[PDB]
User: Fold Putative serine hydrolase from Xanthomonas campestris pv. campestris str. ATCC 33913.
Amino acid sequence: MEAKLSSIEIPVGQDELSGTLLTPTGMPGVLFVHGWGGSQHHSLVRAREAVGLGCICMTFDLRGHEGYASMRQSVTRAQNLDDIKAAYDQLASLPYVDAHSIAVVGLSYGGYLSALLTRERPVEWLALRSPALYKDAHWDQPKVSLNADPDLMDYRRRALAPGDNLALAACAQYKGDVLLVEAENDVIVPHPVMRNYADAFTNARSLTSRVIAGADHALSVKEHQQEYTRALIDWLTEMVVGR
Amino acid sequence: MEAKLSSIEIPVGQDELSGTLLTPTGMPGVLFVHGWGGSQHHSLVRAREAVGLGCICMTFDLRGHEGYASMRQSVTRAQNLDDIKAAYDQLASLPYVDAHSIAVVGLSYGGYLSALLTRERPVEWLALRSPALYKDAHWDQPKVSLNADPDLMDYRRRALAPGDNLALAACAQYKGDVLLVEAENDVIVPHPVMRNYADAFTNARSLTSRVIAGADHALSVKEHQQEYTRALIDWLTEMVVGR
Ligand SMILES: [Cl-]
Ligand SMILES: [Cl-]
Assistant:
């Protein structure tokens, strides 16, 4: 772990002593991207535990949510991807964070967009929980319009190669380490989406994959909600401990 | 390990997103006090390794040294104790440091004064390397005048109770955890000083004590210089890990 030496002046009487403050720097940074209908607050318990590992963390409200709940029906994936890029840039650009060591931790919609993020920004470690899949068609349409299409159900129950889908393509290019967490009984992002993701990541340094037994997409049982916290934190510990 | 949640604004286009930055806070702080003829720089290798444990560290030039080399012949223990208090206050008062968790790490003269420090400021952990002893007589005299007295040799080879010496008294009151490191063949601060210190600390939560085999007061052999680094860092790890 690295230190920053900052010269300082210590007053004592008519005089001032010279000194050095050593503080942490070049720390790994973790970015949490929430799913649709979520908020910056769902991740704080995990963000906290990550700070425990010696990280700097950031959560934020995607547009179309919270302070921009007003955009729920108009916001495009284009715009939400711009949000993730903005958060990323602000986290990477902090002096005490090492831009070469950013983890992104994305959920459902957030997970999809995070997958995409990696083709445009450096992500050392990528952790996806129940990432959504959508058709490449209609990038600049309202994201709610994507779930309007009843055929979405079928699409997430189909087999899909990297060639069929921009997110899956991004994974095929992805070279970092990957954590894939799924909810055994998810009916929103069911196993076949996961199967497609796992299959597409055949260039990552590593691919870890936890399934939470009997969970649903919300991880609505407390114990599942905590299995995931433990899964994520064990992985970050292993990933970030390594360095 | 504790986190500070700081709300932030993330710009993206005409809009600004709300977010939270989580950063470390309430960290333990370590203060290094150098010996006579030393400087803030002797400790940086250790300060560094301490930042590695999740600390904030500080080293500084005692008056009569460096930028105040001019005061070498006049500076009193009074004034050097004021310096240590000043450094301490500046370290404790940092927002990301927990004032209830400050380690002081003092060498020879610095060690003596650090012992004294504990009777006037809260020190959770106190690590003394070859701490000097001087007669209580003449507080406001030039510290160089103390070594002028040829009888100093004898005094550091005598047995001394807490009642005979203000520093030793401070230890008797000390309740934190204590690390005592000695150089086996030190002729400046020889074993009997150490014996007096060890004996006087019979109220500390704990008393660890390493002797560096065959070392001299300067730890002039590289390997001894590193035994001490390892000794100090193992102890801090155990002390500060504990919490
Ligand atoms: Cl579900
Ligand atoms: Cl010696």
In short: DSSP finds eight helices and eight strands in chain B. The CA atoms of residues 80 and 86 of chain B lie 10 Å apart. The longest strand of chain B covers residues 2-12. Chain B has two domains: 2-26, 28-243.
